[PDB]
Design a binder for this molecule. Structure first.
Ligand SMILES: C[S@@+](CC[C@H](N)C(=O)[O-])C[C@H]1O[C@@H](n2cnc3c(N)ncnc32)[C@H](O)[C@@H]1O
Ligand SMILES: C[S@@+](CC[C@H](N)C(=O)[O-])C[C@H]1O[C@@H](n2cnc3c(N)ncnc32)[C@H](O)[C@@H]1O
Ligand SMILES: [Ca+2]
Ligand SMILES: [Ca+2]
Lengths: 351, 336
């Protein structure tokens, strides 16, 4: 696990490098603008001032990321990771800078009022299926064990625990784990924090102000879980952490199964660790994460093939809805938006 | 000259399509065969389906070869050029297939309606109205404009597009004679395995059905270099085009220059700046608000402005993931 230590400080270092990276991007824009003919520059007399506002938004974002860094460096479970790693002050990769940008957007989806419409489209259908299958009239929710793999910043798992179910989120990415630890443990005052999740988008802006607008978080107090709640989060590969068979009443995957190198392996795990009679609720598209990465296994299945594999495992299909429309960390003011026609299904492991 | 080097570079890319795509399928096949036998047995049609993909690749390569030959050793083309090739196949859906009609109706019909409103027969002899369509892609919009009787010229920079528009516009008459498989490179977000290999047919109309006395033409080259004669055009119609500029202010300058006094510029599209993420390329990314302020300072008069014109671009209607654009539509007039 010396390589996990190496990976830990690599991610810490990426968090610390955000401002350097983004300030370079803005300096390229200023350089290019300053090389235009003077008369064209005079057509845009607020352009340089707007770059200054972007730079302030960058500094603010960097301040949020250093707060997360400060939080996770001083966590007891992270003492096994060491002093400061190498004596390396190293630049971070662009691949990690892209993950940082996505992580900032994830705050919108999971912990901002701005993301409520997205959560209503993705999380509420899952929560409703849970209420349908484990209704309060017949089930003590505190004895129903629900696992949420790839929980991201944890809002879905948290919402399930708010209803009283014994809910565990699981997440492999340090970007998400550092950030959700910060939100779930430290952000105990509604909308106290702010970030600028769209400053990286220079294209498709209707108004220049849209790029620098803030989002506030958290929209709920994460510590309003009532007494008797049972909420937890685990760190690691879903496929390695969960080895006990016949354990879970429910597994809820939301925009997750297409993260697999091999989705058949996910299906195999979910079958093994569900209790007889347990259910797997899935909602999401099929954007295979490793498809366009060299030296990475990626088995890309159509939804039709996924359902055929699920049926051959012995699962029984109880709910299937195609074309469940949603966005994912959408920028509502952008002139370009991605939409997903997700499939929702509920399948049961036979008793 | 180095333009003939660039020419043969694109010819070679057309000829490398099958090689590049068969290698992609090889990686999927190798990875599937790497799986444990018990997992491969769950999917007894998987390898046969790759074989259908390979047939569709071969059929696409035949089409590309008739395009290249009806335009007149194989070296590895760049990943950058194969992506442009894949996009060109998709462009056939948008411009010359019935599949693309809903897209054309959302993007092309608003432009044509503004042309009809601004050059009505009660005022204009249409055959003397000169309309320019920069970045005409495969030519459908410019062709529709010429079908109304106006003197319309399309202009296109990309050899991928020019080779293909030449094939469609000059060697196609029989409706739906040809088919392509524009979706075979999409392995993600498929509802049904059959959706990846489904065909589209083109052309949905006969391009040689232009009326008598028509005036339709296409030029090859950089819009900003080819059009130097001032005060020439009655109308310039830009559709998903102005975000292709290194510096959109230069496009605005050219449009101002070559419009006649009283002529109009019709624009519809988003602002996805082509060079934003390309290393060592100039890219001035303006908000729409800033583009409007440049247009106002040039002296254009704003006659029409609609934001949030909703459209897709070479959408795969069966895909589980789709891109939507909230386009701006405007019509501005160079004062008389
Ligand atoms: C597209 S995000 C979805 C996040 C969240 N479920 C939501 O809908 O907002 C998928 C998440 O799964 C995580 N992930 C991918 N593979 C994983 C694995 N093998 N084990 C645990 N988490 C994984 C990624 O880090 C990412 O946070
Ligand atoms: C996004 S496509 C739009 C095609 C077509 N107008 C449509 O709406 O379907 C933009 C087109 O402009 C072309 N283009 C980019 N820069 C150009 C230039 N400077 N001169 C001429 N064409 C250009 C590209 O090759 C491409 O075909
Ligand atoms: Ca300054
Ligand atoms: Ca509190």
């Amino acid at each position: 696990e010396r390589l996990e230590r190496e990976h830990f400080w690599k991610i810490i270092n990426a968090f610390r490098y955000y401002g350097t990276s983004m300030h370079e991007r803005v300096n390229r824009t200023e350089r290019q603008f300053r090389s235009l003919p003077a008369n064209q520059q005079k057509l845009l007399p607020q352009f340089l001032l707007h770059l200054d506002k972007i730079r302030k938004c960058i500094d603010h974002n960097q301040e949020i990321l250093l707060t997360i860094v400060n939080d996770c460096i001083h966590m007891f479970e992270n003492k096994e990771y060491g002093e400061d790693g190498n004596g390396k002050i190293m630049p971070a990769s662009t691949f990690d800078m892209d993950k940082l940008k996505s992580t900032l957007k994830q705050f919108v989806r999971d912990w901002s009022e701005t993301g409520k419409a997205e959560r209503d489209a993705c999380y509420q259908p899952i929560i409703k299926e849970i209420l349908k299958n484990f209704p309060k009239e017949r089930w003590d929710p505190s004895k129903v064990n629900i696992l949420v793999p790839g929980a991201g910043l944890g809002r879905l798992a948290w919402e399930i625990a708010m209803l009283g179910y014994a809910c565990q989120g699981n997440e492999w990415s340090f970007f998400m784990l550092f950030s959700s630890n910060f939100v779930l443990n430290r952000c105990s005052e509604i909308n106290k924090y702010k970030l600028y999740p769209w400053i990286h988008q220079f294209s498709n802006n209707r108004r220049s102000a849209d790029q620098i607008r803030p989002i506030f978080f958290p929209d709920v107090d994460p510590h309003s879980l009532p007494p008797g709640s049972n909420f937890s989060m685990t760190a690691g590969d879903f496929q390695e952490i969960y080895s006990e068979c016949n354990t879970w009443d429910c597994i809820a995957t939301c925009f997750f199964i297409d993260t697999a190198h091999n989705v058949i392996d996910y299906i195999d795990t979910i079958w093994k660790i569900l209790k007889p009679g347990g259910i797997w609720i899935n909602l999401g598209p099929l954007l295979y994460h490793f498809e366009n990465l060299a030296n990475e296994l990626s088995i890309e299945l159509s939804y039709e093939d996924i359902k055929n594999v699920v049926l051959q495992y012995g699962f029984k299909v109880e709910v299937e809805k195609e074309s469940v429309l949603s966005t994912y960390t959408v920028n509502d003011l952008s002139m370009m938006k991605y939409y997903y026609e997700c499939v929702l299904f509920v399948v049961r492991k036979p008793q």
